[PDB]
């Protein structure tokens, strides 16, 4: 008996794009929220005479 | 082409001024560059019984002279670059200072 190759040819082609869709929504959530990430009210500066 | 011979490497003039955390890790690379020009091929493998003889007294505290026997063996695999390789193993002698380089007879 012999049949060597066995792996999925559609379940990886449907994961290689749902992964990049998840990554794209993550990136467009990062860059549409990364304007006022550094807004710190009541930030006092440790600089004086 | 398959030759094998013994050398004395003066590691004192190679590990001069080197930091104390790098004396024995430099000594490994100096033995590799020694065997890269004596029987001058790349792919030089050391022995583990050579590594633990370099490293016998810590990082700092490599001995002043080592007595090696470098064997240019022929590569048993396909090896489609430099089909020869050196193999460096120590010679257990007491007081390894005072010996010339000699060619050991193949057997």
């Amino acid at each position: 008996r012999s049949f060597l190759p066995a792996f999925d040819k559609k379940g990886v082609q449907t994961q290689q794009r749902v992964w990049q869709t998840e990554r794209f929504d993550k990136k467009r959530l990062d860059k549409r929220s990364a304007k006022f990430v550094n807004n710190q009210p009541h930030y006092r500066d440790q600089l004086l005479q | 082409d398959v030759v094998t011979r013994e050398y004395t490497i003066n590691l004192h003039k190679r590990l001069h001024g080197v930091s104390f955390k790098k004396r024995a890790p430099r000594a490994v690379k100096e033995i590799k560059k020694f065997a890269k020009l004596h029987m001058g091929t790349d792919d030089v493998r050391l022995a583990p019984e050579l590594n633990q003889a370099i490293w016998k007294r810590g990082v700092k505290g490599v001995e002043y002279r080592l007595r090696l026997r470098i064997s240019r063996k022929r590569n048993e695999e396909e090896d489609a670059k430099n089909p020869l390789f050196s193999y460096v193993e120590p010679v257990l002698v007491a007081s390894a200072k005072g010996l010339q380089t000699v060619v050991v007879e193949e057997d």
């Binding site: 959530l29 549409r32 929220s33 304007k35 006022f36 807004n39 009210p41 | -």
Partner: protein
């Protein structure tokens, strides 16, 4: 809508910073927090003279 544009709870940050003095959506943790609100030049604000 008479409540369009004004369903925000925003107030300006004032001077002492380096941003314009438009009312800004307070809070955190979302993309809306910090954005300029309540204006007519803003995005999400009421129009100039909302039609009655």
């Amino acid at each position: 809508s008479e409540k369009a544009g004004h369903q925000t709870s925003a107030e300006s940050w004032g001077t002492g910073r380096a941003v314009a003095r438009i009312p800004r959506v307070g809070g955190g943790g979302t993309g809306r927090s910090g954005q300029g609100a309540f204006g007519n030049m803003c995005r999400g604000g009421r129009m100039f003279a909302p039609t009655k």
